[PDB]
Design a protein around this ligand. Sequence first.
Ligand SMILES: CC[n+]1c(-c2ccccc2)c2cc(N)ccc2c2ccc(N)cc21
Ligand SMILES: CC[n+]1c(-c2ccccc2)c2cc(N)ccc2c2ccc(N)cc21
Lengths: 47, 150, 150, 150, 50, 399, 50
Amino acid sequence: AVFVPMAFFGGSTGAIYRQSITIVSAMALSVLVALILTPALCATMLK
Amino acid sequence: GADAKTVQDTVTQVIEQNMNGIDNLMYMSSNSDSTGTVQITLTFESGTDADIAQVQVQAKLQLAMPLLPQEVQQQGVSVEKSSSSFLMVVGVINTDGTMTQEDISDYVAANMKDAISRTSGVGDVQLFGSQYAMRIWMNPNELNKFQLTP
Amino acid sequence: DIAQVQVQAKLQLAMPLLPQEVQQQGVSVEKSSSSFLMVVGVINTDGTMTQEDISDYVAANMKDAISRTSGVGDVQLFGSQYAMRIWMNPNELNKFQLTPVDVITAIKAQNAQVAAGQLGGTPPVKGQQLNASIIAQTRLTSTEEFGKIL
Amino acid sequence: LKVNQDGSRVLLRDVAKIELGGENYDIIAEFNGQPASGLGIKLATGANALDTAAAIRAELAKMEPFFPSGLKIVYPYDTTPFVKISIHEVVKTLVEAIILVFLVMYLFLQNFRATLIPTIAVPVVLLGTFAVLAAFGFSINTLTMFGMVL
Amino acid sequence: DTAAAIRAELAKMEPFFPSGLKIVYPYDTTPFVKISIHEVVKTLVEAIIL
Amino acid sequence: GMAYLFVRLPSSFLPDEDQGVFMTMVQLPAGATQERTQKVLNEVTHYYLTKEKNNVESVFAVNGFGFAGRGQNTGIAFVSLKDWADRPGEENKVEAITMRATRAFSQIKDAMVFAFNLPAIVELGTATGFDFELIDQAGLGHEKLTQARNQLLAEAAKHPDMLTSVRPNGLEDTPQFKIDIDQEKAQALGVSINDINTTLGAAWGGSYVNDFIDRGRVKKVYVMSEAKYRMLPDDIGDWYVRAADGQMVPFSAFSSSRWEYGSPRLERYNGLPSMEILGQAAPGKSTGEAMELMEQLASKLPTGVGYDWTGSYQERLSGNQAPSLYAISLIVVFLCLAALYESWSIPFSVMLVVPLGVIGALLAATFRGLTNDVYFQVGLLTTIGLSAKNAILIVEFAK
Amino acid sequence: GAAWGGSYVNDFIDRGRVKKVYVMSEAKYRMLPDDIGDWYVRAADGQMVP
Ligand SMILES: CC[n+]1c(-c2ccccc2)c2cc(N)ccc2c2ccc(N)cc21
Ligand SMILES: CC[n+]1c(-c2ccccc2)c2cc(N)ccc2c2ccc(N)cc21
């Protein structure tokens, strides 16, 4: 919510600060990717 | 044929006194030309469904269609979805078997234009020229010669 | 929003099967709510005016803007918009051998807007210097000018 | 038109010139000083743009083969190739934002295998974000693609 | 909300009126909803307190 | 400083780009013809072919049709530039190309030619710009409205302050040839007014009569006149109507020739007569001030003349939006720094890394010739996010 | 029809706005049954007919 509040758009600038969310989907997946997966790979194989 | 003042009250104002009871509406603008052409824009809210606003408008103008000159009725009245701008502009010319600024404009509007306007959701097409027509240029001296009028 | 179209584009296949009198009158298909809400009365205090002067000003400044505002269903004007009213005397009709058919004919002739073309358009002679629109018959304005109809 | 007293026939040609020409002589276009017509297509207030213009060439492609001699198509004013640059420059930028990755990850950790995990981390996220924009309504816009880079 | 914007149009109309032309408000539903919020949010508050 | 470098940083919406495609319009004075404007569209095509072969791939002029509206007083050429690879310098890109184009069309011309950039976007969102419109609310006409807008254009241009650029959309104001058909003179000699009206209307303006079929397809049939019998005022009397009594009657018998001033483009807003006004905020001022210092000029005009804003903005982006957005974006942020933390110190640590990164983001934009537009207004929020991160690492690991 | 009930003939312009034009009769010549015969139609032969 640096992102989605700013993505509460108003008017002709609707899709402009909207299309955040594109950003947030990317954030919450980098969380997922790093809450799953990166934990895995790190163990799986490293040194 | 009509001038600016003629179109302004016989068409423009008639449709404007019949442009109400329409869900969602910010404003309405208008033009009336000396060429004999009128064009209104009913702008709706952001994210308004344009598939239905193009009906409430176009079935409302129509209660004022019988209050217009018959000349306008047999001409093209229209209610379309606008996007103040072009995108694809497909020029068309001749090279070998040379032809004119009129022969080309007819073939464009008698083979390709009708198919283009119905293709993948086109708003409106502006033909650069004119489709052919049986054109008759009356001579008024050869009209008086046999006692006749247009 | 769609039931007000299937209905209003179906009545219309029977519009040509009606009298022309009804066609030039107001046919309408609107969304109803058997009841009012805001009822804005309008009167005069200082510069007193009548049950007719007020009803015209209401329906020639505020009514058209009200009906298109924030999704109004239908407006019922309490009175009537002004009109060029003519009260034919049948004794002064027989005096000059005349009917109301002839009165009507003179209004659809002198009270009219005709579309004259333009000087210098539309396909001109290569080298014309000017191009202006022609005015012809203009619609009548006042009660005096309707009195001077021949 | 007429049959005058003496058996002579007044024909329509005998009073007026007759040619097969346009129904509107108001506008005429020149492509590089060469006689030309065309189709200034305009968008439909919600349409899918470059997909719509892809199917402008769908109709147009079936038209070409049945052209008279000399009739060739030409493409001025076109928005299509601008979007082809904005994908080919962004997916390029994207790739350079990796690569430049790898470098920093080796510079700080000489262990190869380590420089690899970050180089899978991010491709996977880019992909999953495409899946959520499709699910929520939006498209691969100029905006959303710049938000894959930020 | 519709009747709020009935006064939106109406407010821009008043200034260009002839002499004497004044607006008056019979039969109006607006103030009934103003009572049903101001009496409910009052009731609400008394249901706390108590 | 963070304040100083921000208030001064001017506000745009979204940068104007090289789109490999621009265009340029034409417009002629009162009552010009198809020959006159075609001479101007010809000279314009030479700047792009003779004096711009390295940058322009093609041109598509169109005579008698501007994006103002229509008529044989206008024109429009659609440029299609050679690709970006063959155009190396800033010189050879739309900003510079349309700059010396405009200079050339103001120098060696004698009408009204411009050349404009291609926004993308739509027409609106010029920023530091507006679109006024003057309305006739009372029962005045087009003649008293023209006088009122002239007065508003004069007060705008006689105390600006801090100045402005303001002009009408296109009511150029040209003459019109009225014909007065006397009705007692007509019926006297025995001519129907019906017959007379389709003689003047079909001859000079044309008339859609009936449909025919050319090569299978159904097209229209028009009836008008040879060009030479309908060019000037004196050709009116050459047309002879037939009277009841089988004898010809010239138009000069009943008609009467005289000129008169009208308008070739009558505009209307919300079912009322009106005229569009296209001004632009000052080089110093910007929009919020310009609009409100045009409102007090409109209220200083004659009776029965109000106003309404076609059509700029509804609520903008530096305005009531941006605040509210950041504002809320803080009331959160401070939260979830509490939902994983508990204190009243942890979050105030993160809540002043905000301006740390921000100052440099300004600096750069304020230094190189960019501006506070959309793209900068989102790298702004990507920073608080990356600062929070870097900071929060400091906090979490240490606590 | 035009005398007793009125008839919408044509449009005119009052003060810029386009309104209607109606044709009917003075009130006193259309109140009772006996006022029917006061109206005289014209016949082909140029003479009045009640
Ligand atoms: C304004 C339409 N509208 C609504 C909406 C608002 C109120 C009632 C119903 C739908 C919307 C509602 C949610 N939850 C999420 C996204 C959007 C949206 C997104 C894009 C757009 N261009 C219009 C949009
Ligand atoms: C300089 C203002 N300005 C612009 C304009 C230029 C750049 C950006 C936005 C508008 C203008 C733009 C086009 N296409 C056509 C006519 C005019 C115009 C006409 C008269 C005037 N007195 C100022 C005018």
